[PDB]
Design a protein around this ligand. Structure first.
Ligand SMILES: [Ca+2]
Ligand SMILES: [Ca+2]
Ligand SMILES: [Ca+2]
Ligand SMILES: [Ca+2]
Ligand SMILES: [Ca+2]
Ligand SMILES: [Cl-]
Ligand SMILES: [Cl-]
Ligand SMILES: [Cl-]
Ligand SMILES: [Cl-]
Ligand SMILES: [Cl-]
Ligand SMILES: [Cl-]
Ligand SMILES: [Cl-]
Ligand SMILES: [Cl-]
Ligand SMILES: [Cl-]
Ligand SMILES: [Cl-]
Lengths: 365, 365, 365, 365, 365
């Protein structure tokens, strides 16, 4: 992803105008390839018209150019672009929201699963690894970079994400479906086995551990559904045709004709079209937005970095469930033990943020 | 459904332009039937005007053509198309979201319902079959392909989805309503009977099993409501009339008139209209999107495949609740037993995805 | 309601064009009354202008007609229509979603309230009737057809929905408010009395029965709030004025003037306006959509049928809680007892729906 | 509020046209003040131009009028109006949805808190009063009419909403913040004290009573946040400027110039502008909608009536928790004791609402 | 933030027009910097054209000006502005909704954690401080003013937010990630340690305390995700280019040319452009709205005041959990002990708000 939040915190003289000099993940980078084709076609057509064509052919070309220019009536490109982009953006954000974070579950596991010794450490670590395995499987199934990192199920064993016995057990199912649901069943069985013992005190703490697992499974299923079902090809093709016909009409129809015929509108000759390139930039970036965001799990610049959160999650959960089981700092009286109105100090650089409490809009009326 | 997600992962020189060569589920396939009628009518009218009509009739036709062309003012077809399509797309996605998956329930059943023997296997299998029966009934009642697969309730018995005794009991209700609610009551009664015994330990694990059933019933009811109540016929007819009047006006009014009368706009004669066919394609695909998505459970190409998930669900649930009751892989120390900072390896092809953790936008200011 | 879902399952040559021949709940039925007034006014004005007016008055009328036609600039009727209709449609669907169905509650009552004898049957039936009484009261208070069916509270006693003692107890409250909240309090008291006894085993099954009642009460309150608070009259009047001024300007300003004055645009005389009637149809159906959907509980064709679900609910709940308390079919081994990969058969007519499971978008890259 | 729902139940010949004769809460009432200023300015400018100005000044005025009229190009007033009004309407409805109703809580209190005597009646009444006190405090802090009714905290004591001891305890906190959170803490403490005794049976019924309190607190906090944070002044000022510049340009630029100069468009002189007043009405009502709905808690006509629900809630809750503790009507066999298919009768006036049950869209294909 | 809610409670003659005189947080304040550049460029270009250029160069400039003015066709600036601003506003409100308030948690802690003595006071205070520490950490990581107030983790110790032992324990983790998740694990461990003792009665009151912590963690994670992932740079750059090209075209193309050439449209010379400055104001404020709201945690005027709620929360929670453990006012009979229909009095200034209860729309039909 690209983070420019620290650059637009305040509104200044140049805030949105200094972002036009960026190169990574920008319209210039996305359209360098397709601007050259447009320029080459435009100049080839202009040269052919101005050198090869004779007088009668030039007259025919001028008549065709007027006929073509009559059809740039702003066909609802400005409508389909925007009615399509809003849906694309909504789908993009909804796809982000269904990323599984085992933070609501590592806390519960570490707090509830008792026993500071072996056979308790092993149980907690296995329980927390079974949750990461499912997210790894679904992310590998839906993400190109994660698939490149783990092309085969043996790479998961080699990387320590799962054991040889687990791989052998997974291979012995004999089902022609994605096996991204097995770790949740393993988690449920292990939790019940742990309850049948001295490691879980009550059944009220066991119906709370098997309630975050259901939510994680639902989120993984939503991710899989988003990957499986895509925006209709009919809608995508309609938008593409509407955008491309505009520039096809512009190519022959926005050319500087001869000014010796007193044509109504074509009066001066310019070497390059200045206000056509700007329209190209605008109307093509508006489409490149959707082109980039149609699949958030890829290798673009504005795409989710799913290879960082399979390691951050692993490290954080393993540290939380093992090294911080019941190791907490000492309890001491705080600074405001005898004061009912604490007043934390203010620094010199942040003294202008002092404000009085808001006491309702109806105060002093 | 049509899946092209793997083809649009990255933005390239041609990403949205190589999708115009697809045939299955595309505008060309959807409009091959209705393009011929338009072309035939256009050419018949042109031939009649240019051969049959005399001079006075030709003058009258020209005056009528100018009057007609004055009325292509972009009547808000570009508005109704889009204000209708957004609603259609929202309804389509909401219809998808209410598909029942018994994954949150098979886990709970397998974990909680105890007993690895007969009378435990039978109880678990019956409990998990009662949930699939209701989804099968509602899907058969709302889906054409599923109805074609199961035209009669005896086909369900023949296919193993339910037993002869269950069919006889269902036939003895005597109610003039859809019987898609009985299996949930059967599930509740069987769960209570199982609790009245040694197969469910506590009442906290029985109020958790009868809480996923309520959610599944709500989802089935939402599906039935979506099937029963449709988008208003008034709105559909308004959109259809608005779209059709546009091309009716185009037919007589976008014809190449005689250029001997110095008409203001009609100057050159072309054999075929190039910029009318493109408008037809765009404005008709924008309507075919809604025509396709108005009923997601059909036999189109971009329609839900409900015949695959009545078998995937059955196989997965039956395997999970029976063959994996408390069969889990052995517990062994993992690779990172003594390391507090695990570092999984990176492959050569995915070495460019290495990134540092994000530590807030306010860092280093 | 009008159901045409079975007619638009697939996209064919004529799918949206065969819906224009429907009469019930259509634009023709909704506008037959107001098309005649428009036609009569148009023809009366035309006859007056063409017969009564003299030469100077005709010249003045022509000047006024040009001035009027200059003001049909598509004032944002196409905007307010659509920005109003989207809100109306959202409110309509939200009003539908808050219809109370006692399916999540009849299951719990039948499963939990124990005792197959008298004083158990009576308790279950009273508990399930108290829930239907509240929905009947709110629906009668908000629906015209239901009020016509039950004009007085004595009709409820006559129809068996409540008892004479219940009516006498309800009459002795002395409050100037709608008494649609009493049955929920009665339900809570009866449930607590049943718990204080042998009919409810635990308090975990009593906090689950008094949690669906709260949701039903919330849904009824939302229905009452939707009935009480309506779309602002200012917004409705703005839309109505914007729509009506358009046709007021069209009446005088879209008339065929004399072609002897070489006017710029008026060249040919037609007996009837063809492209004005189509605009009338479109711009008036777009408003009749909101006119119909502004109150879903009425006597239109596209209005909710609330008189069917006060009887369906009653029959279904009474049968479920009484005749199916713990009567369930026998438990027998199913067809796939010894098979780990069930394969239900496919019919000849549905053999084209066979598909392979989707295994991720990243497969085979 | 204004309720016209009973007037628009069905679509008739005049349904939306008979609402234009209403005076209370209408565009005429909202714009009577500002129509006079516009008319006076228009006529003063016209009189000055037609009497005071000489020939050269008149020519200059005509040139300026053409220049001004060239700038009425429908600047996106039709866009900002509507993109602003949708947000305003959404905020209005969301503000309504967060009104606290203690109906989910009075039921639980009356059902669970046991003891029909003194020290039980007192406890229930105090528990139900602590909930109303917080809603009264927040509504007084955010609503002008409620503040006018209760200008001082002593008025609450005088009106019986709280006791002298409660007022003295509230005055002894010494915090410079709104004290709308204290009653919830008092409720929690009183509930725990009641549990530490014989009035609450289990801790499962105490975690259910302290779960509605959290929801009520969240709703009150949302109301306070909506009051505190408003729509940006930049956006409001942008909309106001865009609307006002339109009529500023209309004033000088939509005047009837002299027809002796053969100007292109100004041909006939009318005493009053007919199609300018209609545009004023439409474009000004579209803004008065947002002006009215920007603060739902005021003294307009289409504003929430918060002074009725501080009394309705009090009476209803006090009656429910005290006079109906365990007083319920007798249990008797209903009318359909021996009938499995109840058939309630239909009246003559509602005999046309009889319908058959819907059995799926796939039936009979 | 800027609060003007008390000024727009009612709709008056001037309600939205008296807000144009505000200076703080307004379009004038936001555009004073960039209006001068536009004016200077315009006047420099005008002076150069009218003094430096010769006759032929002036003719070329006039031809270029007509060519430029032909390209102000309202390129969809009015569309992108609004389709971008709606998304920005939605993100802004969603960012506000995820602010953690420990009001649902301080109530539960004070009510449930028993013991009015030392080792109970210490436990409650530590439990309530661990929750504030996490919100302080995330707010410091995402907010510029909070970072300025607390530039280093030692400032938190100096300000009393955490202890030296806690700082030393936090420093000994050795992870390259944001440590905003540790306090939640500490809270869970401390809660379990408290349960293992006499301070928590049941496990039903311990699964309720560790359920608000999960919600607070989810809200903090959502805030962090919103900070990390921003609106695409492609979309921002597209909007900026579309807005800037409009005024670039206006600069050369909206100038008063010589009126001696009878140009079609340029007839009168004005010293300053009046209707260009208004367009600048409108089209630039519409963009400054998004420029301001793109990062709600900054130092603008319409930005969240996060430095007030780290102190309000601290004071309120510390007072609630310590000084109000089980200190509640005495229980006495209220004013309406013997009255079933309480009637609170109405003041003279609020006597016009008396209304009758709404009894359904179907009443009296
Ligand atoms: Ca991508
Ligand atoms: Ca279909
Ligand atoms: Ca209706
Ligand atoms: Ca108001
Ligand atoms: Ca900011
Ligand atoms: Cl799922
Ligand atoms: Cl150009
Ligand atoms: Cl349902
Ligand atoms: Cl053509
Ligand atoms: Cl309610
Ligand atoms: Cl006509
Ligand atoms: Cl809050
Ligand atoms: Cl006028
Ligand atoms: Cl999170
Ligand atoms: Cl100007």
């Amino acid at each position: 992803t690209i983070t420019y939040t620290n650059k637009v915190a305040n509104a200044r003289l140049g805030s949105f105008s200094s972002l036009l000099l960026c190169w990574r993940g920008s319209i210039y980078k996305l359209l360098y390839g397709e601007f050259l084709v447009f320029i080459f076609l435009y100049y080839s057509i202009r040269g052919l018209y101005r050198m090869v064509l004779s007088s009668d052919q030039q007259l025919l070309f001028e008549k065709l150019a007027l006929y073509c220019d009559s059809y740039i009536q702003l066909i609802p490109i400005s409508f389909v672009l925007g009615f399509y982009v809003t849906l694309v953006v909504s789908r993009w954000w909804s796809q982000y929201e269904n990323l599984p974070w085992p933070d609501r579950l590592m806390i519960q596991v570490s707090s509830f699963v008792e026993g500071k010794d072996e056979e308790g450490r092993l149980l907690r670590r296995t329980l927390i690894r079974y949750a990461i395995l499912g997210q790894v499987l679904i992310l590998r199934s839906i993400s190109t970079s994660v698939y490149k990192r783990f092309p085969t199920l043996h790479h998961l064993v080699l990387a320590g994400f799962m054991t040889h016995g687990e791989h052998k057990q997974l291979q012995k199912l004999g089902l022609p479906h994605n096996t991204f649901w097995v770790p949740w069943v393993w988690f449920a069985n292990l939790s019940m086995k742990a309850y049948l013992g001295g490691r879980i005190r009550d059944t009220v703490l066991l119906q709370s551990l098997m309630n975050e697992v259901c939510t994680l499974r639902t989120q993984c299923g939503q991710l899989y559904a988003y990957d499986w079902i895509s925006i209709p090809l009919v809608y995508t093709q309609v938008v593409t045709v509407a955008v491309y016909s505009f520039f096809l009409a512009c190519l022959i129809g926005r050319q500087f004709l001869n000014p010796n015929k007193d044509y109504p509108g074509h009066e001066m000759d310019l070497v390059v079209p200045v206000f056509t390139i700007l329209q190209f930039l605008f109307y093509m970036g508006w489409l490149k937005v959707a082109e980039q965001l149609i699949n958030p799990f890829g290798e673009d610049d504005d795409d989710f970095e799913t290879n960082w959160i399979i390691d951050r999650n692993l490290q954080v959960s393993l540290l939380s469930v093992d090294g911080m089981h019941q190791n907490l700092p000492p309890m001491e009286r705080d600074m405001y033990w005898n004061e009912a109105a604490p007043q934390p100090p203010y620094t010199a650089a942040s003294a202008r943020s002092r404000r009085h409490s808001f006491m309702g809009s109806t105060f002093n009326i």
